[PDB]
RNA sequence: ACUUUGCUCGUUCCCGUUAUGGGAAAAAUUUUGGAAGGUCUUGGUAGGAACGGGUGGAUCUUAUAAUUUUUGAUUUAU
RNA sequence: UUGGGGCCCUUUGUUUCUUCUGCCUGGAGAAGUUUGACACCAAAUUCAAAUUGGUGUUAGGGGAGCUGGGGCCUUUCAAAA
RNA sequence: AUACUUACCUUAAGAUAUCAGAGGAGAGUCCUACUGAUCAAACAUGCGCUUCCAAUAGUAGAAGGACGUUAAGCAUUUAUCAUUGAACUAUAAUUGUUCAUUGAAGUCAUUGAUGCAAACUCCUUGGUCACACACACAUACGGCGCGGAAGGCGUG
RNA sequence: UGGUAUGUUC
């Protein structure tokens, strides 16, 4: 007999063909991915604080510290700290999910763009891309998307697209700035830019 | 005959029958006639001792053990008298019985 | 007719164990698995007169300061070469083989 | 190391202890066990594998010994090429705190079974 | 029957693991499909011989008895196989 | 078995004139129908005749250079003809069940009520009523939308994509039955 | 050992009498076990008992002393 | 109830049982608590919103009542010197 | 979520501590809210028991490390073979010396590897606890405070 | 006497 600890589903006598097919089906994938995400979120979010050790402080430290100054404590209400911590959590997860993708879109017209950056004609890890296609045995998963594939083959040479400026490129993205410190940008530019 | 299809809980009788009338005739003769045997082991530890018990794994209890080995550098023989010993059948190369 | 049940009747017995690596282990027995995975306490172990692998295995167990004194060692079955029992114990009463007696009475 | 390992404990009782397990080579693994089996296959959390070099072995033969430590993290070690295991360091939380944690796990598991019985109805 | 460690080895399928062999060669790669007999298959394998050199295999398959150990990733630190008191929701008849 | 050594001992004991009723002639020629449906849902149980690998190797060595036996081939042809007749009867029963499901009482009553209201401007109204009746018939047929497999006699679907269909064709039942159809067609081409 | 007759010493009380006997308790006191009360300290306070399993997980035996751990090719020697 | 003095506030979401209001001229107020409630993750439904699958929490200290056990003292019964 | 099709499979067994005695069931076996003894588990409980628990009358320090710095620190050791050409020491598949054509793989590492040794900095842990800044001891030390962590022994 | 996974309609 076999029991899945993730899906909480039982099974018959332990056949490798059934157990292999169980770890491919979509319900086990959803339950396993959600369980790993929640356990990682719990071990990040668990603030294991140190146990405090307070000793009887010295006399001259008390005459020095109680005479210098008294600082002001800031504090906020419940909805304010809840909204601020929710914005900080979405900022932490969008920084953990993002990555710099300037070299992919900056060498887009390079003659070896179809041999390294296409990520399907790659030599060492291209067989891993060509192996598991997620073959979409549902007809709705193949009939949902109606856009182009734009699969760049390896055999694209330098004869195609000879002049990269006549074929309309994209203007590069500006360096993004922090929205909390966006009020200190120089409002006057150096040169006159139109449109 | 296959081992799994013989019977249930009667394999001990066949094991005793193989003990009485098989390759175990020398370990049986040494424990009933208290004769000393010489067991050569896989690390040159030759044991002269009397057999006290028999096991399926050839795990043997030995009494009045006189063991001897040889250090080769130069050539010396080092011996030791051990009263009680429980020897594993993994280490046993061979068992010789004297008449 | 496995003689591991003979060692199961040998609790609180102060024995030595020579291993296949060459280490002599002096200590009292606490328990032994039927697969002969024996645990020992109040242990000192010594590699006699060499084998550098055995010297590494002797030192890298904590509590060296070549007699190494350790509090609790579990020993796997296939690493046991031989075990020496104390001579004061009576082998005629511990090898009664009550399971073999019940098997003979069941015949 | 004044730990005073338990005098009548086995592998079910030695769980979550910082073991110092020895192998046939002497490649000593230090880490917390979290599971075992009949073949004594041990998973090891925050594990480190320490060895001694061949040049240090001459100094070890009859002081300081420079061991080579590599970090394995969470590994799973087989029971074939191991020799002996000892208990090196005690865990963080105590026996009473593990007892309260086990009671909380039992109450949470009973609540989960009540939730499964409520969802089944 | 099977036990917790072989279920943990079957748990981390499709992840970057690192094996060490009994000879001393350390492999590292993505686990294709593990078995109950631990005869494990790896892909994008980088290998270190006991002599010292580093090479790269595409698709390796090592037998379970010639394995010193294997390293699973750290997020399997928290697994339901490690739970001691997990009850069982009504096994079938 | 729990140990592989007993499995290897079983393989040795089952591996180590020839015209005897104990030898399965359908397995002696090859691809016995009691072997191709061993553990599936269409299982026949257990073959009463014994199967052997040494006799199969001797038959392969005889058919390689020595000679051939037409009696075992005729027995395998008769067994394949009986199994093909049983499968054709099952496929005819499935086609009759599909025709009965397409001709149910309430479905034919709803179709007759839609066609009774189906009767330039009158031609356009009749074309719109016929399009509405065709949409109602498509909605009635889409409640099941189960076709008939032309070879194995199972159920298929038209709106289903080719990947799930390719997963359907790679089974023990379909591979065994296509092999039995190939053997039956080869024996009918050799006999006729 | 029972039994009787008198002497002597003697725990406590009475009487013939403060020599000494007679009678009674055959006692005051020490220990163990059981019943009750008071005081000091600690744990628990919402589940528990019985039965039923073509129940789940652990432990033992045999398959299993033969290539997958656990019944050995890891003391590097001819 | 007020006032003074000493320490702590890392409780870093300013008590972390939860929700809401709210705080350093202060340390608070209201509600609820295991077939329930709270917070979060993942998704297709083309904002938000709603649905489904899971994860984690429901705490700490003191007091009245009941009960189990350990030690001392007192009363009574049975037995041995 | 209901209804249907398809792909794979449909189960190694036996038992739940041991010994002695009495009774019952047609030499062997089973049962006793049957009796004595040993052992195991759980919950309490006590042993002038065993080990440990970090200054604040200061700006420290105990344990484990740095996969940290000085540090390319100091002292040593290696960084491919074969055929031939112009000389050649020469028992080798010209090994040795200088230069080159060609042939098979060809770890990166020489700021590399091993040994030695000091200093600085930073991480995880604690009772950073209650009274006092005190004259005890050959039977060597009044272990006769509130606890916590680990363990031994004993009782119910 | 059943289980796991997948694809359509409400």
UniProtKB/Swiss-Prot annotation, chain A:
GO biological process terms on file: mRNA 5'-splice site recognition; mRNA splicing, via spliceosome; spliceosomal snRNP assembly
The organism's place on the tree of life at top rank: Eukaryota
Basic residues bias: start-end ranges: 47-59
Annotated segments matching region Disordered: 47-69, 135-175
Keyword Metal-binding: yes
Zinc-finger ranges (Matrin-type): 2-34
GO MF annotation, one: zinc ion binding
One cellular component term from this protein's GO annotations in UniProt: commitment complex
UniProt keyword annotations, A-Z: Metal-binding, Nucleus, Ribonucleoprotein, RNA-binding, Zinc, Zinc-finger
UniProt key word Zinc-finger: yes
Annotated compartments: Nucleus
Principal place of residence: nucleus
Effect of residue 11 to A/D/E/F/G/H/K/P/R/S/T/W/Y: Gives rise to unstable commitment complexes
Subunit structure: U1 snRNP is composed of the 7 core Sm proteins SMB1, SMD1, SMD2, SMD3, SME1, SMX3 and SMX2 (Sm proteins B, D1, D2, D3, E, F and G, respectively) that assemble in a heptameric protein ring on the Sm site of the small nuclear RNA to form the core snRNP, and at least 10 U1 snRNP-specific proteins SNP1/U1-70K, MUD1/U1-A, YHC1/U1-C, LUC7, NAM8, PRP39, PRP40, PRP42, SNU56 and SNU71. YHC1/U1-C interacts with U1 snRNA and the 5' splice-site region of the pre-mRNA.
Family note: Belongs to the U1 small nuclear ribonucleoprotein C family.
Note, other: Present with 2140 molecules/cell in log phase SD medium.
Name of the protein this chain belongs to: U1 small nuclear ribonucleoprotein C
Residues represented out of the complete protein: 3 to 197 of 231
Swiss-Prot record, chain D:
Protein localization: Nucleus; Cytoplasm
One of the protein's GO biological processes: mRNA splicing, via spliceosome
GO cellular component, as recorded: catalytic step 2 spliceosome; commitment complex; cytoplasm; nucleus; Prp19 complex; spliceosomal complex; U1 snRNP; U2 snRNP
Comp. bias intervals (Basic and acidic residues): 98-108
Name of the protein this chain belongs to: Small nuclear ribonucleoprotein-associated protein B
Domain notes: C-terminal extension may function as a nuclear localization signal (NLS).
Keyword Iron: no
Record-level Gene Ontology MF annotations: RNA binding; snRNP binding
Motif (Nuclear localization signal): 95-121
Chief localization: nucleus
Superkingdom to which the source organism belongs: Eukaryota
Organism taxonomic ancestry: Eukaryota, Fungi, Dikarya, Ascomycota, Saccharomycotina
Record's keyword terms, sorted: Cytoplasm, mRNA processing, mRNA splicing, Nucleus, Ribonucleoprotein, RNA-binding
Entire-sequence positions represented here: 2 to 131 of 196
Family from the record: Belongs to the snRNP SmB/SmN family.
Organism name: Saccharomyces cerevisiae (strain ATCC 204508 / S288c)
Sequence ranges assigned to domain Sm in this UniProt record: 6-91
Key word Cytoplasm present: yes
Function: Plays a role in pre-mRNA splicing as a core component of the spliceosomal U1, U2, U4 and U5 small nuclear ribonucleoproteins (snRNPs), the building blocks of the spliceosome.
Assembly notes: Component of the Sm core complex, present in spliceosomal snRNP U1, U2, U4/U6 and U5. The core complex contains SMB1, SMD1, SMD2, SMD3, SME1, SMX3 and SMX2 (Sm proteins B, D1, D2, D3, E, F and G, respectively), and is probably a heptameric ring structure. SMB1 specifically interacts with SMD3.
Other remarks on this protein: Present with 861 molecules/cell in log phase SD medium.
Swiss-Prot record, chain E:
Pfam families: LSM
Gene3D superfamilies xref list: 2.30.30.100
Keywords: Cytoplasm, mRNA processing, mRNA splicing, Nucleus, Ribonucleoprotein, RNA-binding
Phylogenetic lineage: Eukaryota, Fungi, Dikarya, Ascomycota, Saccharomycotina
The keyword Nucleus belongs to this UniProt entry's keyword annotation: yes
Compartments it resides in: Cytoplasm, Cytosol; Nucleus
Function field: Plays a role in pre-mRNA splicing as a core component of the spliceosomal U1, U2, U4 and U5 small nuclear ribonucleoproteins (snRNPs), the building blocks of the spliceosome. Also binds telomerase RNA and is required for its accumulation.
Taxonomic source organism: Saccharomyces cerevisiae (strain ATCC 204508 / S288c)
Subunit and interaction comment: Component of the Sm core complex, present in spliceosomal snRNP U1, U2, U4/U6 and U5. The core complex contains SMB1, SMD1, SMD2, SMD3, SME1, SMX3 and SMX2 (Sm proteins B, D1, D2, D3, E, F and G, respectively), and is probably a heptameric ring structure. SMD3 specifically interacts with SMB1.
GO function terms (MF aspect): mRNA binding; RNA binding
Signal peptide: none
Single GO BP term: 7-methylguanosine cap hypermethylation
Highest taxon of source: Eukaryota
Domain spans labelled Sm: 4-76
Full protein name: Small nuclear ribonucleoprotein Sm D3
Gene Ontology annotations for the cellular component aspect, listed alphabetically: catalytic step 2 spliceosome; commitment complex; cytoplasm; cytosol; nucleus; precatalytic spliceosome; Prp19 complex; SMN-Sm protein complex
UniProt record similarity statement: Belongs to the snRNP core protein family.
Keyword Chaperone part of the UniProt annotation: no
Classification via PROSITE patterns: SM
Swiss-Prot record, chain F:
CC terms in the record's Gene Ontology section: commitment complex; cytosol; nucleus; spliceosomal complex; U1 snRNP; U2-type prespliceosome
Superkingdom of the organism of origin: Eukaryota
Pfam annotation, one family: LUC7
Signal peptide positions on this chain: none
Keyword annotations: Acetylation, Coiled coil, mRNA processing, mRNA splicing, Nucleus, Ribonucleoprotein, Spliceosome
Subcellular location: Nucleus
InterPro entries: Luc7-rel
Additional information: Present with 2270 molecules/cell in log phase SD medium.
Function: Component of the U1 snRNP particle, which recognizes and binds the 5'-splice site of pre-mRNA. Together with other non-snRNP factors, U1 snRNP forms the spliceosomal commitment complex, that targets pre-mRNA to the splicing pathway.
Name of the featured protein: Protein LUC7
High-level lineage: Eukaryota, Fungi, Dikarya, Ascomycota, Saccharomycotina
Gene: LUC7
């Amino acid at each position: 007999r076999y029991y899945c600890e993730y899906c909480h589903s039982y099974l018959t006598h332990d056949t490798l063909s059934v157990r292999k097919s169980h770890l491919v089906g979509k319900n086990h994938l959803r339950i396993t991915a959600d369980y790993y995400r929640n356990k990682a979120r719990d071990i990040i979010n668990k603030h294991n604080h140190k146990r405090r050790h307070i000793g009887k402080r010295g006399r001259k430290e008390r005459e020095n510290s109680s005479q210098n100054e008294t600082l002001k404590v800031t504090c906020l209400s419940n909805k304010e700290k809840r909204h601020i911590m929710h914005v900080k959590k979405m900022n932490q997860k969008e920084l953990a999910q993002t990555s710099i993708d300037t070299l992919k879109l900056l060498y887009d017209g390079s003659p070896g763009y179809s041999k390294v950056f296409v990520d399907a004609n790659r030599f060492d890890i291209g067989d891993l891309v060509k192996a598991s296609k997620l073959p979409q045995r549902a007809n709705e998963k193949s009939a949902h998307h109606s856009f182009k594939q734009t699969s760049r083959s390896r055999d694209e040479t330098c004869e195609s697209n000879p002049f990269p400026r006549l074929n309309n490129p994209k203007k590069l993205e500006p360096p993004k700035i922090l929205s909390q410190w966006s009020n200190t940008i120089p409002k006057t530019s150096i040169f006159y830019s139109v449109d | 005959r296959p081992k799994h299809e013989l019977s249930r809980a009667e394999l001990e009788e066949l094991e005793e029958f193989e003990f009485k009338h098989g390759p175990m005739s020398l370990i049986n003769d040494a424990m009933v006639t208290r004769t000393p045997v010489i067991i050569s082991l896989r690390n040159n530890h030759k044991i002269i001792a009397r057999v006290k018990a028999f096991d399926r794994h050839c795990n043997m209890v030995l009494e009045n053990v006189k063991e001897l080995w040889t250090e080769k550098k130069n050539v010396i023989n080092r011996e030791r008298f051990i009263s009680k010993l429980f020897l594993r059948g993994d280490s046993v190369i061979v068992v010789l019985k004297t008449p | 007719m496995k003689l591991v049940n003979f060692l199961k009747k040998l609790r609180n017995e102060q024995v030595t164990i020579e291993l296949k690596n060459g280490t002599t282990v002096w200590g009292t027995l606490q328990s032994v698995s039927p697969q002969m995975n024996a645990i020992l306490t109040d242990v000192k172990l010594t590699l006699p007169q060499s084998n550098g692998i055995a010297m590494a295995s002797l030192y890298l167990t904590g509590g060296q300061q070549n007699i190494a004194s350790l509090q609790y060692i579990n020993i796997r079955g296939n690493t046991i070469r031989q075990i020496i029992l104390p001579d004061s114990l009576n082998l005629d009463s511990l090898l009664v083989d009550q399971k073999q007696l019940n098997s003979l009475r069941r015949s | 190391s004044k730990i005073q390992v338990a005098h009548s404990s086995r592998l079910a009782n030695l769980i979550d202890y910082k073991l110092r397990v020895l192998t046939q080579d002497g490649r000593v693994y230090i880490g917390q066990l979290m599971a075992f089996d009949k073949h004594m296959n041990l998973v090891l959390n925050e594990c480190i594998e320490e060895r001694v070099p061949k040049t240090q072995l001459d100094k070890l033969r009859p002081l300081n010994i420079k061991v080579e430590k590599r970090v394995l993290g969470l590994t799973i070690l087989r029971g074939e090429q191991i020799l002996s295991t000892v208990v090196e360091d005690k865990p963080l939380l105590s026996k009473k705190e593990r007892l309260v944690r086990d009671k909380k796990e039992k109450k949470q598991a009973q609540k989960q079974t009540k939730l499964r019985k409520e969802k089944e109805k | 029957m099977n036990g917790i460690p072989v279920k943990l080895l079957n748990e981390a399928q499709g992840h970057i693991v690192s094996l060490e062999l009994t000879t001393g060669a350390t492999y590292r790669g993505k686990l294709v499909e593990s078995e109950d007999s631990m005869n494990v298959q790896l892909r994008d394998v980088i290998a270190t011989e006991p002599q010292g050199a580093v090479t790269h295999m595409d698709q390796i398959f090592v037998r379970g008895s010639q394995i010193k150990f294997i390293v699973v990733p750290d997020l399997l630190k928290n697994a339901p196989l490690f739970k001691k008191n997990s009850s069982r929701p009504m096994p079938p008849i | 078995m729990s140990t592989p050594a007993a499995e290897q001992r079983k393989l040795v004991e089952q591996l180590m004139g020839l015209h005897d009723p104990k030898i399965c002639k359908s397995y002696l020629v090859g691809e016995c129908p009691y072997d191709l449906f061993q553990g599936t849902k269409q299982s026949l149980g257990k073959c009463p005749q014994m199967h052997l690998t040494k006799h199969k190797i001797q038959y392969e060595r005889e058919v390689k250079q020595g000679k051939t036996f037409p009696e075992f081939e005729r027995e395998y042809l008769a067994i394949l003809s009986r199994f093909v007749n049983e499968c054709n009867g099952q496929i005819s029963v499935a086609l009759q069940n599909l025709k009965h499901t397409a001709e149910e009482r309430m479905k034919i009553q709803q179709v007759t009520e839609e066609l009774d209201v189906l009767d330039l401007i009158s031609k356009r109204k009749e074309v719109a009523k016929r399009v509405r009746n065709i949409t109602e018939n498509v909605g009635q047929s889409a409640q099941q939308k189960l076709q008939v497999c032309e070879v194995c006699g199972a159920y298929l679907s038209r709106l289903d994509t080719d990947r799930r269909l390719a997963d359907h064709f790679l089974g023990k039942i379909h591979l065994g039955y296509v092999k039995m159809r190939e053997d039956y067609d080869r024996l009918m081409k050799n006999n006729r």
